[PDB]
Structures are given as C-alpha cells and as structure tokens.
Design a protein around this nucleic acid. Structure first.
Ligand SMILES: [K+]
Ligand SMILES: [K+]
Ligand SMILES: [K+]
Ligand SMILES: [K+]
Ligand SMILES: [K+]
Ligand SMILES: [K+]
Ligand SMILES: [K+]
Ligand SMILES: [K+]
Ligand SMILES: [K+]
Ligand SMILES: [Mg+2]
Ligand SMILES: [Mg+2]
Ligand SMILES: [Mg+2]
Ligand SMILES: [Mg+2]
Ligand SMILES: [Mg+2]
Ligand SMILES: [Mg+2]
Ligand SMILES: [Mg+2]
Ligand SMILES: [Mg+2]
Ligand SMILES: [Mg+2]
Ligand SMILES: [Mg+2]
Ligand SMILES: [Mg+2]
Ligand SMILES: [Mg+2]
Ligand SMILES: [Mg+2]
Ligand SMILES: [Mg+2]
Ligand SMILES: [Mg+2]
Ligand SMILES: [Mg+2]
Ligand SMILES: [Mg+2]
Ligand SMILES: [Mg+2]
Ligand SMILES: [Mg+2]
Ligand SMILES: [Mg+2]
Ligand SMILES: [Mg+2]
Ligand SMILES: [Mg+2]
Ligand SMILES: [Mg+2]
Ligand SMILES: [Mg+2]
Ligand SMILES: [Mg+2]
Ligand SMILES: [Mg+2]
Ligand SMILES: [Mg+2]
Ligand SMILES: [Mg+2]
Ligand SMILES: [Mg+2]
Ligand SMILES: [Mg+2]
Ligand SMILES: [Mg+2]
Ligand SMILES: [Mg+2]
Ligand SMILES: [Mg+2]
Ligand SMILES: [Mg+2]
Ligand SMILES: [Mg+2]
Ligand SMILES: [Mg+2]
Ligand SMILES: [Mg+2]
Ligand SMILES: [Mg+2]
Ligand SMILES: [Mg+2]
Ligand SMILES: [Mg+2]
Ligand SMILES: [Mg+2]
Ligand SMILES: [Mg+2]
Ligand SMILES: [Mg+2]
Ligand SMILES: [Mg+2]
Ligand SMILES: [Mg+2]
Ligand SMILES: [Mg+2]
Ligand SMILES: [Mg+2]
Lengths: 231, 48
RNA sequence: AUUCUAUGAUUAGUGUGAACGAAAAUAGAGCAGCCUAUUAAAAUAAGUAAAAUGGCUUUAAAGCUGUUUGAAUAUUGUGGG
RNA sequence: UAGAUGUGCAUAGUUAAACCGAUCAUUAAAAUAAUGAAUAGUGUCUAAAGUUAGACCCGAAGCCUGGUGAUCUUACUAUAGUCAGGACUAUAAAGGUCCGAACGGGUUAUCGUUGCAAAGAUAUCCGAAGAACUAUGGUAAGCGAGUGAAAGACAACACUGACUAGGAUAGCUGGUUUUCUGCGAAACCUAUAAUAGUAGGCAAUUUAAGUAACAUCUUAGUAGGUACAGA
RNA sequence: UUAUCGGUGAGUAUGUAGACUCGGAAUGACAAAGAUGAAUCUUGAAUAAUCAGACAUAGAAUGAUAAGGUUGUAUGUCAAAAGGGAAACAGCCCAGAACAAGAGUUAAGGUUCCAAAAUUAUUAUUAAGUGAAAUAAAGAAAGUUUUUAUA
RNA sequence: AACAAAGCACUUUGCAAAAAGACGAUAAGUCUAAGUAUUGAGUGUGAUUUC
RNA sequence: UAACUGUGCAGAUACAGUUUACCUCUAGUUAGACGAGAAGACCCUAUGCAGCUUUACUGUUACUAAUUAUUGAAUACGAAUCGUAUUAUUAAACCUUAAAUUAAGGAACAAUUGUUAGAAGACAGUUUAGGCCCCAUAAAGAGUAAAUGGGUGUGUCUAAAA
RNA sequence: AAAUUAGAUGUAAAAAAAAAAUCUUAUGAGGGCGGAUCCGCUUCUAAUAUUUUUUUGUAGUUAUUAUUAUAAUAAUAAUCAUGUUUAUUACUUAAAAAGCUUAAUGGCUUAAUCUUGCCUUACUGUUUGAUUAACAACAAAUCUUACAGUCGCGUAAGCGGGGCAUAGGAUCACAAGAUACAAAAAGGAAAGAUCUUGGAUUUUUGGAAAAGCUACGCUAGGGAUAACAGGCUAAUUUGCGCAAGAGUGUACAAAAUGAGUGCGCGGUUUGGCACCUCGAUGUCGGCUUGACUAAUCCUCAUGGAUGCAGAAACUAUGUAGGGUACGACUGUUCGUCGAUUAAAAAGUUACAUGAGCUGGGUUAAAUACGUCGUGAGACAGUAUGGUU
C-alpha cells in the first residue's frame, strides 16, 4: 500500500481559475503549457491569470502537441490566430501617489544625535604626425594619471568614513549594511572586475620587445667601438 | 563516511555560514555567496 | 515568633513524560512576650560553620547526614542569608 | 462622624520576549514594499458539560505490610507404654528371621457417589522385636522458606508457598428503572506495540446567520481509453 | 535435390490479450447558464455514535471457472423497516406502519377447493401426472406434432 | 522400576583462640563437639561376584 | 409440552404442509428435550497475572582485589618531605588467652568504617509486542482490497575542472 | 560468431496576378440598431484557413532542332548559385532504441540530450494561489506567485530560490555560529529564548534500551473453529454409473475384456471452508439393543455366452424375506491366520446407542529409557501405574 499520487486533471474545460491554481498534474508533458499558463518543476501546469481553462491543439506552434490555456473571456476559443492582437488585461488598481518628502531629523526624542559621522586623516612630415600621435597618447596618459589620482582620493575618504548611528539601548555602532557598501556600491563584486585592459597589455608587450631588440643594437654597436680600437 | 558535511564560513567575519556536502577524497570547497549580514556577495571558505 | 483555615496556585518551578508543586502577600481564628524566662536555664557557644566525597531533601541555593578534613570575632563592617 | 481595608475578570493590541503601542512583529539600517492581528464586559440563577476526586453501577487473579497457627500433619525432643501363640536359628537371652492375632498399613475388586462417611462398608492383601507402633508435653512455618528415606510432599476448609486484617485496578463481561414528541447514523479513511481500544476526519443532532446554497434535468463545453472492436 | 529442420524478407493472411489499443461507446466525473423541487447545502455556536457488517445482482481477483469460502468495485436491501408476495423466510419481488371506517383504487403476486378473486375467452402442443413456485447432463430410440425437401 | 539402604568412590576439614559446614534485619553466639584425618561435612554410586 | 418431510443463527414439542391422537394416572425404561451439575474441558485474546529457566533488559548481594582513617617507631633504598623494603616492639597502637597482670604470644599485619573496581539467575524487578519508488489488478475523472501479481527496484549520486 | 572505419529518404530555392463564394477571427471602419470600449443583434473592409474552386501567366538565360531574313520565331532539354563544391539554406526522413545519477512508467529531439564560453540563484527575509481543501484527519511533505536585498549569464527578450519527473524522519538532549530578548536584591554571569546548521538501519522509519518455559498454571473474556459432532463444498477416495471404443479375445469390437478420456450421480475415506465453543488426538473398539438403505456373500426367478454339450464357473437382469457363526494372534476396525459353514457381504443412523454398560479408549500429576534444547522443558515417542 503506497500513498496515492492523484495525477490527472484538476480543472476541466471552461472552469474558472485564478493565478497559481493547478490545472493538470502529470509525469512528463502529456499536455504542454499554452496561453497564459506556467509549467512547474514536475511538469504541473498552473494558471498565470484569472480566467477559464481551455484544452486545445495548436497546429501552427507544433504539429503534434496538445496545450492547456487560460482565456479572459469564457466565450473565446483557442488557439488564437497568430495575426490577431494579443488579448491582455491591465491587472492594476489606481491609487493616489505618495507625498513623501525629505524630512530626515537630526536628534532623537532624548536629544541625542541620530547619526555621528567620523572621518579619517592620513621622416620629415611623418615626424610631425608621430609627434601628434605621441602627444595624444602622452596627453591621455597624463589625463589617466590625473584622474586615477582622483579616484584614489574618493575611495580613501569613503573607506575611511564612519557613520555611527543610534540603535537600541542608547548604543552607537556602525550598521553592517553600510560596512558592506564601503568598498563599493552594490551591483558588482569588487575584485572580479579586471583592473587591466587587454589593449594596454599589448602596448606594454611591444614596448618591452622594442627595448630588448633595441638593447641588442646598442650592445652590438658598443662592441663595434671596442673592436675598432683593437684593430 | 564517504561524504562529509562541511561549513563554508564567510570571510567578512560576520559569522554567517553555508553547509554543503562533498566527498572526503576531494579538495576543500570555496564559493562566492551572499552574506545576509552585510548584504553583499563575499568569499566563503571551508571552516577547517 | 509559632500553630490552624482559605486565597495566592491546574502559578513560579521541576520532570523526557505522566504528574508533582512553593514562597512573598492578603483575609479569618487566636495574639505574648522573654533570660529577674513566674520556676528557676547562657559566664553568648569549635571538631562547630564549612570543604571534598557517598546519600537524603530539592530547582543548582538553603536544610539533614556517614567517611576524611577544617574557620572567623561585631555596622570602626567579624560571621550567616 | 470621617478615612482606609479585603482574591478576581474586563477596559489594547503585538512578539519567542521586552522595548514599543493604535499600532506591533520578520526585513541583520530604516522606510504603507509585502504578510498577519483591533472595538462589551461582569455577576447570578436553571440546564448540559470538560478536568480532578470512588466519579454510572457490580465483578478478578494477584502485589505489599502487620499479625495468627505445629491440639491436623512432617521432623526432632523429653518422659512413659505396648507387641496372643507357635516355628526356625548358635544362644535361656545375640535375627531390620518365619507363620499369624491385637495394633499399624491400604494390594486388588465391589458397593457407595444429593453416600452411614466432604475418604465410609465388605472381602482380599501387606508388616507385625523393629528404619516398629502408641500416649502426654516441648521445639521448628510463611520478604528469606519450617519439615521433608524427596511426592512441588506436608505446615489445622486453603499450599508450584497457608490463614487473617489493611491498601487496588480491570482497553474485559454483565446491568443501568416513567411517558410523549422531533430528527436520525456507521461498521469507512488516517495515526497508534495497533487490529476487543483510542484519537482526528467523514459525519448524526441542536438552532442561529447566510445562500449565485444543494439535488435533478435541459443545452453547449471539457477531462479520461473501459465494454466492444481490431491485428 | 527436397512441398524435410531452423532462420530471414513479404502478406490490407488466421487466431491470441491484466501490464497490445490505431478505432471506440454507454455509464460515471468536473464546471457554466436556465428551469423545477419536499431546505435536501454552507457557515457560526454547542456536541455524538461508529471503526469484524451480512446477503442480493452485475463484473473481477483468489480457490479447482468448488464452497452459505476469502477480497476489491457499482447499486440496493437488511442492519435500524412493520405490511403484501416468495408454502415456512434479516438480506429476494413490491411497498415505507400516527389511529379508525370502506364489497373504495392499486403494486408485487394471484383468481377449481383448502383460501379473497375466472372452472374467463382464442390458437396450438403434451399423454409422460411430464408438468403444475428450487429445469440433474451427454446420449439413445419406427413416441408424437409441425416445417422444409422428396417417391 | 521411584526414595532410602548397607557397601564403595571422590572432594574438603590441622582445631593457635572460628576445623570445615549450617544458622544468626546481624552480630555476639549456637549446632557440629565436651568430636580431632579411622573426625565432621558435601557429592555421586547403590550389597556381594566380575569390573 | 405428538409423528414425518421441509424450513431456519445452518440437528424443531412450538415455524410451513400433511398426518395421527377420547380425558387422567400407576409401574417400568432412558431415545430426545444440543438433559442437570462441575465455569469441569479445548483454542484464541489481554501492552491482566503467578512460578520457573537462561549466553533476555536493568539491578542487589555472596565473594575477590586496592585504599583514606583507627596506625606509630627503627633501618635501608628511591624520588628536609614523600614513597618503597626489612627489623623490632609492658618498649602500654590494636588482637588473642587471662577480672583482665610490669604475665604469654601475634603484630603494624589482621580487624572494622568510608570510597573504588571486578564479580554467580544465588536473589529481586521488568520485558519478550515492518519504509520508499514504478507497472498491472482498477471497472475510459481521482480513489480502491487481498502473506494480490510483477520489478537482479531503492535505501543514493552529483561543486562542474585538471 | 565476436575489434576499427566509411555509408545507408526525398524535395525545393526568377516570378505570379486576378474573380467570387463558405465560415472564422479583428484593440478594423472608435460602423449601425437595441440596450468608442461592456453585452445582444448586426452590414462593410481586412487577414488567416478552406475549394478540385474561376482562371490568366509559367518567362529569361545556355544549347539543340525547325522555319524564316548573324538575327527573328516555335518547340525540346537544362537551370538554387557572382559563390573558396566538402557548397549553402529550408522542409522532410515509420516505430522501437540510445542519452537524460540509478528499476519501471511517462516525457524530451522545435530540448529536458550533447558540445563549448563565462559562472556558482545548490542565494537571504517575508509572501501568493493550489494539490477539485496533498496523504478520504492533524503534522512532516509537493508545485507555484509576489516584494525587498544583490549576483551570474545574455545583443536583447529575459532566465536562475539545484538536478526531465516519480525512491533520504520530528521533538528532546548535545554541539558550532549568529540574535541582544529576559538576567530571581543590584552590577555581571550561569542556566534559558529566537534564527541557521550538524551528528540517527531514531529502519517497529508519527520516533520502548527488552529472551524463553509452564502437561501444575491463575483471572477476565471471545468462542475469528481451536480437540468433537452438525452445516456448506466435492479437490481426493478403498463410492459408483453412463457414453465412446485404442486394444485383448487363434477368427470375431461389445461372451468376456476396456488404455488415455468425456458427461454425470452420491456423500463413505483423506481434505477445503469456518455458520457454530463443548465431550474430543485411533474417532474409534467391544457389549446390550435396534431401526433403515440396497450398489447381493448365502438362499429364490431369469437373459447372454463361434468363447452355454453336461457339471462347475463367468457376465447381466429381478429380488433385502431370513440369515452372514466360532476361535487364535494382533493395543484397535486396520488387519493376519485356524477349522467349520448354504454363506461366513457391505453401508447409514452425533464411534447409531457411556443421565444403558465397558475404558480397549478420551487428558493429566509418578517413574525409567530414547530423541531434541545452554537450560526450564518439549515429543503424532516407548513401558508400568493411575476416583468414569
Ligand atoms: K510550569
Ligand atoms: K547544600
Ligand atoms: K507375617
Ligand atoms: K498440594
Ligand atoms: K423520519
Ligand atoms: K432419556
Ligand atoms: K434407571
Ligand atoms: K537456579
Ligand atoms: K470509473
Ligand atoms: Mg497555602
Ligand atoms: Mg551566637
Ligand atoms: Mg553542615
Ligand atoms: Mg551561598
Ligand atoms: Mg549555612
Ligand atoms: Mg495586554
Ligand atoms: Mg501433636
Ligand atoms: Mg520380622
Ligand atoms: Mg515375609
Ligand atoms: Mg502412608
Ligand atoms: Mg448410583
Ligand atoms: Mg454501509
Ligand atoms: Mg480493547
Ligand atoms: Mg485511441
Ligand atoms: Mg461470505
Ligand atoms: Mg448492531
Ligand atoms: Mg420485512
Ligand atoms: Mg400459493
Ligand atoms: Mg370489490
Ligand atoms: Mg373463493
Ligand atoms: Mg409431479
Ligand atoms: Mg558394588
Ligand atoms: Mg567455624
Ligand atoms: Mg541410582
Ligand atoms: Mg543399578
Ligand atoms: Mg428438521
Ligand atoms: Mg404455535
Ligand atoms: Mg513474567
Ligand atoms: Mg614481641
Ligand atoms: Mg527472575
Ligand atoms: Mg481511474
Ligand atoms: Mg484532504
Ligand atoms: Mg543579578
Ligand atoms: Mg541572587
Ligand atoms: Mg509506526
Ligand atoms: Mg505517513
Ligand atoms: Mg464467525
Ligand atoms: Mg484382432
Ligand atoms: Mg446378482
Ligand atoms: Mg442362454
Ligand atoms: Mg449349465
Ligand atoms: Mg414374506
Ligand atoms: Mg462401535
Ligand atoms: Mg446418551
Ligand atoms: Mg513428569
Ligand atoms: Mg532423560
Ligand atoms: Mg496397583
């Protein structure tokens, strides 16, 4: 004696259903999900919208599948023609908007600061063109260093800031969520981002290769001056 | 005996942990998980 | 101060459970204070308080106890809770 | 005269809990972002009830504690008594010797079976100087077991552990007393050291608030593969 | 070299079916609207009994296609339901008893007598008391009737 | 036909303060025993004959 | 307070049908009244009991060993303090004989107390009552029983990279 | 026989236009009419589908042939190709099978399979609607939604709260982190409280630390049939019949005989069931006394029998009036034998009959032996004894 699984149809055709209601429990897709329907992990079909269950076949979608849908109007018939405009319901209620306004207080009912902030302290014409190329690169290299120095000042101030906030029991401590946002704003995990750029690496690889080859030129030329004196 | 239950301790020193199973004849576990105390994804490492 | 009755209380608490189960306080019955005790007693208490261990009681405290050990001397803050 | 006194419940909700409070709780900071919870009590009588007490009534075998009994019977103990006659044997008297009365047993059969008898009658049979039998006292018995030529034998109606007094339970069985009126089941599922029980459902009853209630049919629609038929 | 053995290919060939179903009912199930109906339903408050069921009919499992056997399903009765019929009868066929009256009207079932009501009409068979309210079989044979052929 | 039994066998008991054994909510102590290894207790066997 | 056949909680004096029989006693007899009595006899049940057994569960003891205390000396040795070994002791621990002593012997053992460990059914109490998954049975929704039929079923595997 | 590799369907790719009809749809004409969008009626246009419908066109290019004056015309064949022919792109290619953690079932081929890149959402809190109100209760479970937080992948849309689906148990105690709730005079603490998590043949898996005997058994009950008989059934039988006829009978089926079978009756043996508690485990024996049945051992009548000459005997049809004795050995009936006899046949009746007898039996406690068990004990054992 096992516990019965009770598989099969839980809603017959034209039966009213609201979102989440199970329509068909199955082992595998005996009936595929169709219009306004969801399939769960175990292939159970649920209504996604309020409406009436409809069992149909869509030869345009799949030649040999049978689907279950949900129509907002009991008199509608599926499958809807592919060229007809989608039938959808708003599903929203109108309410007056909020009158929220920035009214952050400074002191609690006991006269104590809500937050106390502490900061820390610690080749004729080509040469002309190449010069324009070098200047542009040198200009950006100066700008990059003129702005990377700026980022190192905002990070230092942020990571060094300490906003102590009033908590229960008249205690003053830093909240854990603010401690998390010290390293950086949410949205990405600091450290996973690649600090370097692939294009910059290629540029460095060439420069190192040039000095190496050019290094042999100077050493080879230097050796020639020593040989001239010998001869 | 073949499988052990390890504890992945947060590296934010917040005291939150995740428990996953792994075979003994394998390497220690190490994952990037969400620490609900600081509400940020940090590095979790096996306890021992 | 003690004793008797009810409430406090199928409570605090204990116990795997089943069950077991206070005290403060309140009300009533009685009421009484003393050591020169209204019938003749203390020169204010040392193998004692307490500790370890084996049990009892119990909530782990307090209380009772066999074995082995073992203190201090008054609010000018000594000793018990 | 005046003032105080004597349990309790309700008046505010919320959370594990406090803070907090028409707001509170989870959201590791908070914030209508989400979710839950908000408004007549109290006393009395009549009746039906849950709980704890004997608990609707009657009924065990047993277990523990305190007492009683060895005038029955078993063994031992002290003091006493009894055993016609004959035969054999080494003795006058030396033998668990022989036949057989008293006495002590109880072998076989019959009767009896609300008997004369809660162990008898008749006949038959066994021992009958010995490990014999009998009398009057004494000692030893009931958590442990007294006594036992040993049979779970006997210890005064009872003994695989007596009698008496005190303290029980029984999911098991039986019984539960006047009339009239209205409604009216189930013998199924789940759990259970459970199946003779019980609990939660389904669900019978009472009487209030609701009903786009429930039942049946018609019309259109939907799920699902049996009978049949087929290879 | 075989209308021998096995195997393979073809067949719109024949059969077989709890785990074959291309085809495919009725029944039953779900829900919508309308109508009808004897409140039969839901909720609130209060609060039960019951937890070996039995037989009948259909269709199965099991047994041996045995059991007044055992075990599911569908429907009913009994259980807790008297009355009429089944000779007597828990379970079958009818029908649900508040009390009387009536050659009243009917169900199931019956109508010669016991015993209320037909010895009522029509057409055939049976001659064995077969039979007449619980079918013993295969089979045999100048029993007899009818039909179809036939001399 | 069972128990006992005489006979036989084995184990244990040295008695110097308690011989062993039995008994004593548990001891002093009692039986053993006014006994002493040929004594006492326990165990099995069951005269003798053959073993 | 009849016989037969039938029926029926399944063996009829009492029901159905038929049959038979004047009323009422006496003495005999025991076929039936599932005759009376004995809860006498058998099986099953109870999370009822009793006794017994054991390599059942949990315990207490017989018994063995160690140890603080009663309990001190002398010497030797090992680590003034501890521990070990031996010797002696009216030279008043304690023990035995002995009204019970400057007597005799034993002797720091024994014995007793507390604690600890081991240990006999010798004794006591109590117990002894298999989940999950798939298919068919299953009767065209779901459900559906049987020490029913099938399954070499399952009591898991898996961090993803070298 | 069994090793690797290569294979194993077909089609299409210049291009159509146009007429009406049948529905169906439309957030089209804000159509019209009733009650811009709702609802019931509705004409028109548009789109999809369908017709076999109504047709028209089916070229151009390369080449061939024919006529015409290298060109023109007609027919025929080829024609996806401005593209590294290994072409490419789209559709098509039964079922089963392989693969998807593991059996089976279903599903997936348009991905749930496979390969590759980057990842670790196998996330935290709360929460929605369902499983015709999960398991016909509760709980542990299964699927699903939303909001906040912040991460991955992706051009984007978006997807992600592990796995294609269906096979891994709580509390208590204990342990490791967080929470900052309470802290028994007070300040701390201990021991508690909330959240997360771990170790379980908690495998009797809604969750006890657990062996037997009693024939000396006790009490309370049920008689779920247990020792009997009755009741239902008839597998089996040491109970029978009928039908058919392989075969035997020197010949010749049916004088006799009758394989393996079929259709049956009947309730004696061994069974099944369990309505039912009662005189039992050899369920039965002997004695006394019967009553009934007929499937006949004796006695009486009789058919068949190349296999009835006579006699005897065989087979069958009528017939149950009266008989079917006596003893030995076997616990018993089972049986076996002895000698007579016309013959020494069977069955039913609660073993027919123990409020008629017996105790051969139906049950004990004693004792010995045998077998089994560590033991208490057990045995359909054996022997003696045992209030009817
Ligand atoms: K409490
Ligand atoms: K204390
Ligand atoms: K004599
Ligand atoms: K007795
Ligand atoms: K009624
Ligand atoms: K009689
Ligand atoms: K008589
Ligand atoms: K014993
Ligand atoms: K069905
Ligand atoms: Mg009080
Ligand atoms: Mg004082
Ligand atoms: Mg003290
Ligand atoms: Mg203290
Ligand atoms: Mg004190
Ligand atoms: Mg409050
Ligand atoms: Mg006497
Ligand atoms: Mg003599
Ligand atoms: Mg003699
Ligand atoms: Mg005697
Ligand atoms: Mg008599
Ligand atoms: Mg019913
Ligand atoms: Mg019960
Ligand atoms: Mg089909
Ligand atoms: Mg039945
Ligand atoms: Mg009843
Ligand atoms: Mg009736
Ligand atoms: Mg009639
Ligand atoms: Mg009339
Ligand atoms: Mg008449
Ligand atoms: Mg007749
Ligand atoms: Mg001898
Ligand atoms: Mg002694
Ligand atoms: Mg002997
Ligand atoms: Mg002998
Ligand atoms: Mg009868
Ligand atoms: Mg009558
Ligand atoms: Mg017991
Ligand atoms: Mg000396
Ligand atoms: Mg015991
Ligand atoms: Mg079904
Ligand atoms: Mg439910
Ligand atoms: Mg404190
Ligand atoms: Mg304190
Ligand atoms: Mg269970
Ligand atoms: Mg369950
Ligand atoms: Mg029954
Ligand atoms: Mg022949
Ligand atoms: Mg004859
Ligand atoms: Mg003749
Ligand atoms: Mg003749
Ligand atoms: Mg005559
Ligand atoms: Mg007889
Ligand atoms: Mg009789
Ligand atoms: Mg015996
Ligand atoms: Mg023996
Ligand atoms: Mg005798």
């Amino acid at each position: 004696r096992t516990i019965p699984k009770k598989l099969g149809a839980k809603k017959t055709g034209d039966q009213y259903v609201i979102p989440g209601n199970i329509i068909y429990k199955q082992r595998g897709t005996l009936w595929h999900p169709g219009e306004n329907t969801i399939m769960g992990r175990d292939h159970t079909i649920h209504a996604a919208v309020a409406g009436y269950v409809k069992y149909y076949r869509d030869p345009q979608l799949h030649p040999d599948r049978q689907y279950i849908g949900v129509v907002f109007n009991r008199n509608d018939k599926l499958p809807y023609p592919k060229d007809a405009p989608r039938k959808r319901k708003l599903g929203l209620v109108a309410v007056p908007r909020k009158v929220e306004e920035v009214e952050k207080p400074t002191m609690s009912a006991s006269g104590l600061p809500l937050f106390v902030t502490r900061h820390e302290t610690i080749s004729s014409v080509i040469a002309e063109l190449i010069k324009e190329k070098l200047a542009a690169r040198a200009e950006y290299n100066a700008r990059q260093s003129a702005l990377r120095k700026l980022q190192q000042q905002k990070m230092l101030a942020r990571r060094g800031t300490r906003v102590l906030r009033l908590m229960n029991n008249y205690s003053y401590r830093e909240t854990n969520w603010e401690i998390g946002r010290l390293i950086g704003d949410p949205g990405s995990v600091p450290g996973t981002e690649k600090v370097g750029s692939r294009k910059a690496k290629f540029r460095a690889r060439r420069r190192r290769r040039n000095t190496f080859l050019l290094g042999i030129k100077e050493r080879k030329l230097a050796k020639a001056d020593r040989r001239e004196e010998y001869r | 005996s073949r499988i052990i239950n390890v504890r992945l301790i947060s590296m934010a020193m917040t005291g939150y942990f995740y428990t996953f199973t792994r075979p003994r004849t394998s390497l220690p576990m190490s994952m990037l998980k969400y620490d609900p105390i600081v509400r940020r994804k940090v590095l979790f490492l096996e306890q021992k």
